[PDB]
Design an enzyme around this catalytic site. Structure first.
Site, PDB file in Angstrom:
ATOM      1  N   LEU A   1       3.136   8.011  -2.325  1.00  0.00           N
ATOM      2  CA  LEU A   1       4.110   8.915  -2.924  1.00  0.00           C
ATOM      3  C   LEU A   1       4.988   9.621  -1.900  1.00  0.00           C
ATOM      4  O   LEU A   1       5.988  10.232  -2.292  1.00  0.00           O
ATOM      5  CB  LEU A   1       3.392   9.977  -3.766  1.00  0.00           C
ATOM      6  CG  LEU A   1       2.294   9.549  -4.747  1.00  0.00           C
ATOM      7  CD1 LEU A   1       1.618  10.791  -5.303  1.00  0.00           C
ATOM      8  CD2 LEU A   1       2.840   8.679  -5.874  1.00  0.00           C
TER       9      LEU A   1
ATOM     10  N   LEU B   1     -11.222   3.657  13.274  1.00  0.00           N
ATOM     11  CA  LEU B   1     -10.371   3.100  12.239  1.00  0.00           C
ATOM     12  C   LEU B   1     -10.336   1.586  12.398  1.00  0.00           C
ATOM     13  O   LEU B   1     -10.287   1.070  13.517  1.00  0.00           O
ATOM     14  CB  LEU B   1      -8.964   3.697  12.345  1.00  0.00           C
ATOM     15  CG  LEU B   1      -8.907   5.222  12.197  1.00  0.00           C
ATOM     16  CD1 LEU B   1      -7.536   5.770  12.518  1.00  0.00           C
ATOM     17  CD2 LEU B   1      -9.298   5.595  10.789  1.00  0.00           C
TER      18      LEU B   1
ATOM     19  N   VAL C   1     -10.729 -10.267  18.238  1.00  0.00           N
ATOM     20  CA  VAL C   1     -12.045 -10.192  18.875  1.00  0.00           C
ATOM     21  C   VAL C   1     -12.764  -8.912  18.470  1.00  0.00           C
ATOM     22  O   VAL C   1     -13.987  -8.905  18.254  1.00  0.00           O
ATOM     23  CB  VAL C   1     -11.893 -10.322  20.396  1.00  0.00           C
ATOM     24  CG1 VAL C   1     -13.244 -10.149  21.093  1.00  0.00           C
ATOM     25  CG2 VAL C   1     -11.272 -11.672  20.734  1.00  0.00           C
TER      26      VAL C   1
ATOM     27  N   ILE D   1      10.470  10.509   1.272  1.00  0.00           N
ATOM     28  CA  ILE D   1      11.389  10.427   2.401  1.00  0.00           C
ATOM     29  C   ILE D   1      12.548  11.360   2.060  1.00  0.00           C
ATOM     30  O   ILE D   1      13.548  10.950   1.460  1.00  0.00           O
ATOM     31  CB  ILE D   1      11.830   8.973   2.690  1.00  0.00           C
ATOM     32  CG1 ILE D   1      10.766   8.214   3.502  1.00  0.00           C
ATOM     33  CG2 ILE D   1      13.090   8.927   3.533  1.00  0.00           C
ATOM     34  CD1 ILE D   1       9.372   8.179   2.921  1.00  0.00           C
TER      35      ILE D   1
ATOM     36  N   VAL E   1     -14.034 -15.736  18.497  1.00  0.00           N
ATOM     37  CA  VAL E   1     -12.694 -16.234  18.777  1.00  0.00           C
ATOM     38  C   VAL E   1     -12.805 -17.243  19.919  1.00  0.00           C
ATOM     39  O   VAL E   1     -13.026 -16.852  21.076  1.00  0.00           O
ATOM     40  CB  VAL E   1     -11.751 -15.079  19.125  1.00  0.00           C
ATOM     41  CG1 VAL E   1     -10.373 -15.605  19.397  1.00  0.00           C
ATOM     42  CG2 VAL E   1     -11.803 -13.982  18.031  1.00  0.00           C
TER      43      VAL E   1
END
Lengths: 558, 558
Positions: free
Chosen positions: A476, A421, A51, A479, A25
């Site tokens: 799936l 992650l 970065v 809510i 970068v």
């Protein structure tokens, strides 16, 4: 006797050390290095969209091929702190990457300047070396030492911080007589290998454990030579996966975990002897549980038996680079072969094959919504033996069941110890940069995929194709919108009603729209019989447009 | 294979690395190591009267002979913090010592508690490695690594911290197959030596500067061969002193100051080319001054030009161990000589000898009180070429002055860069332990002598003879008017009325009574003609009683 900027001399050193690729970068404090990259030539720059993405690209670039060292470039201040997670993931797996940051000018060093940070102290715990170079004449020599340190001993990353005024100072430097420093490794002795051979030949059910150090030392060939010469079966660790092919007759399974209850991979508990090469012993649940046994002897060959010794003391230990060791183990094992001193292992090896062929869980699930096990089964069908997998999934399964297969060293590219992650996507791009034309398959859930999602644009800009298998268990997730337990569970999960969707939904992020806007291709799969055809369409799209292709598989769970 | 305690395995590794001597202060937390020294045998322990003295003894023991590594032993807590000054003095001069501390048990380790300290963090800035060993099985391998780190690269000290329970634990270890790790050194290439030879031959008035790295690499013989082969005059640094004999025709002075402002060494200002080997160029305070000029080219050969190259960048640098480099330089200079291409330097060497002959102070002082210059002139008459001097005196002269002479490598033992007050007495004791039968002569003012004065009892207990030249400038007493501005000055000087003296005085400490109480012999000198006879009586008393002999010389100043 040329005169040049310190940063031009740094570029000459990197090229003479074999660098032709960097991820970065750009910024103002590190601009002189970019101008030097343009002037000297010979380094291809791949611009990252974060970065941290550049540091994981560098990590994947290193891991893809023995002798590679990924280079990661950023500007002053926050760029350097953005690298810490990538340096940590790399050092935890003994992976070298070179990070270079720009910095405020020297007189401004000890004040809290506009974008000036004590990157030296922050990065010291996650590097083998981290230095701010305050003398311009020293810049080429810091880079030369950096390459020695990254390659020597236990391999690991280095950070070089370069003040803006240091980079532009003219210095003397002579590329024509530059040479790399010698590489240091501990070396096994013949007497040490002969002693380990005596304990091996005394045993009735020997096993070889082949860890990441075998691959790190480029010693998988010698590991298989030694296994075949002695007839001893091999059990790779997760970091050792692919150091012997999964369909090799002496490949008799993987260490599914370490000391986790009664999970047993059958071949280990049968054995009376275990020789680990280049392997860690994963944690014990804070004390001796399973693999440790009074009736089972252990030999440990590692580059640093100066740190890994969590079996509470191996029966015998050898401090050695795995290749130097294995070259001696092969030479001695031939001498015992010619003399008729080696015990025959044909019966015990055939028993190991039987337990391996029996520890099989069915995973042809027809379920709708799709079960994760069906995805891996279709992946084994879809991709060749030469596929290179990229992922941070340490939980393939709890203990025993169908998963993937690896056949060549460095075709399992996994940040096992750290594995943040978001590592997977930039790492897979670094692998693609290191192996143009190779078939690369990443595997992630949606949370991992989202962290560094914007790096997919890097593969569209620079045409760095790979296939992303994206398993989405948030799609799936209902809510319920009744406030009993849903409202609290909502705050710690990924689903929400996407208001840009045609219909009532709890999909959360529409990854296909995101991936398309980033310049890449994407497919969605709802039924198990569509997984394999989608993987085949992904390879075709990848060959056709040479950009990343995402296959989103809709899973049952949330 | 029998099990042994971790600390027993550490003693086996130390013996196998060549340790037969240790200096130390016993205590409870380190006691198991002492028991292991007894059971294993082969290591002679010299008990110090202060932990700092144990560390300066190890320092002097290392410097006395190539390959020696002094060992310093102490208990948990404050004994560790007492080693920091000795660790600093050694690392500043690239001297290895191994410091071993006991430590509180792991069960209450990270929590602070009685006789427990984070010696790891405190000692990291003044060691190449400082490690608390938390796994008993790793103890032998930490010591094996410490010997590699101490000898490799730029040599330097290591601290190993051992919790009490870790020392006790049984482990497996095999002395029979133990081997030391390979030593790492950078190595000059032929092409680099050929380019340096080219710059050297191109010049008309060359000089070699021989620094401490020539002696540390055991390269003084090669340095003399190279100077004799090329005809190039040599100027040792203070740390390089004795790498060429002082009466050698090519030895044409020492570096008189890093920047003697204008004055300087006349041969340095005359030169058009300087090649430094194993030397440090300092910056007396980043002084823009006469060491460097645009016409004078500088070549620097050093094991660590990754931090050194202070003449605002040498015209050319070579990263190499000084022995490996000088072996190559001699071979290349032979080829250049055989080709008829080496310049004749004899006319240039001769006028360097004239300038050396003429820039001497021909001053023999009869004064009472004695002048310090007269003491050095008499030391030169009393002691032969095989004397070993030990001191931190540093400032023999403001530019050039009557001082000592050195003829052999390691016969000048001086903590130059970081020599604390009190280094000299324990350092000479360690030199004496390294070289029984050798004639060792220390030199100190009274302040430096008082810091570690109690260590003289170590020389009486273990019969470690050496001659201490003690120049006392506080003995005469008072200045100025009585009880006026003297009252302020009294607080920053050492004289006082010793009430145990028969007569009115401002003697301060009676060093003779102190030395006598410590079990050693002492003499006092007031008149210059008594200095040489005092030194010769000191030699006889040393041979007869085999304990330290202090010669106190009464000087003029205060």
């Amino acid at each position: 006797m040329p005169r040049m900027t310190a940063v031009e001399a740094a570029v000459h050193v990197m090229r003479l050390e074999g660098v032709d690729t960097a991820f970065g970068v750009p910024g103002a404090a590190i601009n002189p290095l970019y101008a030097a990259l343009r002037k000297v030539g010979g380094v291809n720059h791949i611009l990252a969209r974060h970065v941290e993405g550049a540091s994981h690209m560098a990590d994947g670039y290193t891991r893809a091929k023995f002798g590679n060292i990924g280079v990661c470039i950023g500007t002053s201040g926050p760029a350097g702190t953005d690298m810490i997670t990538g340096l940590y993931a790399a050092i935890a797996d003994s992976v070298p990457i070179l990070c270079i940051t720009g910095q405020a000018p020297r007189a401004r060093l000890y004040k809290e300047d506009f974008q000036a940070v004590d990157i030296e102290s922050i990065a010291k715990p996650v590097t083998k070396m981290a230095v701010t170079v305050r003398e311009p004449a020293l810049v080429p020599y810091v880079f030369q030492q950096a390459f020695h340190v990254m390659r020597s001993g236990r391999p690991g990353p280095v950070l070089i911080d370069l003040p803006f005024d240091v980079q532009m100072t003219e210095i003397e430097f002579d590329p024509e007589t530059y040479a790399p420093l010698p590489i240091y490794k501990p070396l096994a002795t013949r007497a040490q290998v002969e002693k380990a051979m005596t304990m091996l030949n005394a045993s009735e059910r020997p096993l070889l454990v082949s860890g990441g150090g075998v691959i790190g030392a480029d010693a998988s060939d010698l590991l298989v030579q030694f296994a075949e010469l002695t007839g001893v079966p091999v059990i790779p660790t997760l970091m050792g996966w692919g150091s012997i092919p999964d369909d090799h007759p002496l490949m008799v399974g993987m260490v599914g975990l370490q000391t986790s209850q009664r999970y047993g991979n059958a071949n280990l508990l049968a054995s009376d002897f275990v020789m680990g090469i280049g392997n860690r012993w994963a944690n014990r649940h804070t004390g001796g549980l399973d693999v440790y046994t009074e009736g089972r002897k252990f030999v440990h060959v590692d580059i640093e038996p100066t740190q890994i010794g969590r079996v509470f003391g191996p029966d015998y230990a050898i401090v050695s680079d795995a290749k130097a060791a294995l070259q001696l183990f092969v030479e001695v094992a031939r001498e015992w072969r010619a003399a008729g001193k080696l015990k025959d292992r044909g019966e015990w090896a055939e028993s190991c094959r039987e337990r391996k062929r029996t520890m099989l869980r069915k995973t042809h699930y027809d379920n709708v919504p799709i079960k994760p096990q069906r995805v891996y089964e279709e992946m084994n069908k879809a991709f060749g033996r030469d596929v290179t997998y990229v992922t941070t999934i340490g939980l393939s399964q709890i203990a025993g069941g169908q998963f993937l297969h690896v056949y060549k060293p460095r075709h399992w590219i996994n940040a096992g110890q750290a594995g943040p992650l978001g590592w997977t996507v930039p790492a897979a791009l670094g692998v693609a940069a290191a192996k143009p034309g190779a078939e690369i398959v990443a595997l992630s859930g949606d949370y991992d995929f989202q962290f560094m999602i914007e790096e997919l644009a890097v593969g569209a800009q620079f045409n760095l194709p790979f296939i992303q298998v994206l398993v989405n268990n948030s799609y799936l997730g209902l809510i319920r919108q009744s406030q009993r337990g849903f409202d609290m569970d909502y705050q710690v999960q990924l689903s929400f009603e996407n208001i840009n969707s045609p219909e009532v939904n709890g999909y959360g992020v529409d990854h296909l729209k995101v991936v398309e806007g980033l310049g890449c291709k994407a497919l969605r799969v709802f039924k198990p019989d569509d997984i394999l055809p989608a993987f085949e369409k992904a390879r075709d799209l990848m060959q056709e447009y040479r950009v990343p292709v995402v296959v989103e598989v809709i899973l049952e769970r949330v």
